[PDB]
Amino acid sequence: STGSATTTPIDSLDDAYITPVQIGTPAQTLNLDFDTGSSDLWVFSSETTASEVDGQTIYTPSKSTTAKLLSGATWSISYGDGSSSSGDVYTDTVSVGGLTVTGQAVESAKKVSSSFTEDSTIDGLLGLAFSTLNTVSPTQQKTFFDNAKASLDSPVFTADLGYHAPGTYNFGFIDTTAYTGSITYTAVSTKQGFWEWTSTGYAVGSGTFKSTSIDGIADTGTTLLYLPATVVSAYWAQVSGAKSSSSVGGYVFPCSATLPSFTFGVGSARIVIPGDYIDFGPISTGSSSCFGGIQSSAGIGINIFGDVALKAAFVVFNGATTPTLGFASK
Questions:
Q1: Does the UniProt entry include the keyword Transferase?
Q2: Residue 199 annotated to the active site
Q3: Which domains does the chain have, with CATH numbers?
Q4: Is the dihedral of CA 171, 20, 138, 102 positive or negative?
């Protein structure tokens, strides 16, 4: 089997991407944030505290003839941005782009933190990291991909995120029309539950490539590119007036600037992030200070190849017995 679904930016900055997902019988379609940095499929629901729902579409398990309470199971998750959610668990039929999994754990939110409430466009998350990170207790549950894998034509999914435009998540096949050149595959460590890999270096603009190993994660659920402070300083030093602002929370730059590109290495191959992809617009409405799309990972503990980096590539998440990642230009 295969599946193919379009993923759409939630706003004009590509802060996140939403993909429609069918849950239950009859189908209830929710727009979920596919997140290769986490491993829970959770949704706003009829159980979510009413004051914490503000425009999201909810899953109502009582209206699904295939929903079953997973008795005694609870979940609770905190994300790197300080947001969180928790609740109980149903199993139900879940379909993405024509690919159907029966018995998928659908984690129903009883509580969500303010940033989720405040984002009316995201009805929940669909985790695509390794199932070892799934938070369901006392019986850990499998991701949608893990449940689907055995049925797929090939044990892979691909992320093809657009810049200010829709893109595609495919399951079970690699669309050879969706990228240019060849796909370069690189090793993955699953030890922390992430799609963790080592980039071979970077360049700023037209500058020379610096060969240096940068361990990090391919994370579709993180907006920006978070890299070591040395690398990030070297980038922003090429932008007149750019500075790190403790009050804003990262590097800012004059909105009048034209940003240089940023290249990252995948083995001997190179992925070029155009400068425009690094512009996240005014820090507050009407400001002439703009927020940078490359930020330091120093306070995180891991480097994160988030959407800024991934949307410059066609990315293969290869879930073969030994997982690997593939990157191609597009």
A1: no
A2: yes
A3: 5-174 (2.40.70.10), 175-330 (2.40.70.10)
A4: negative
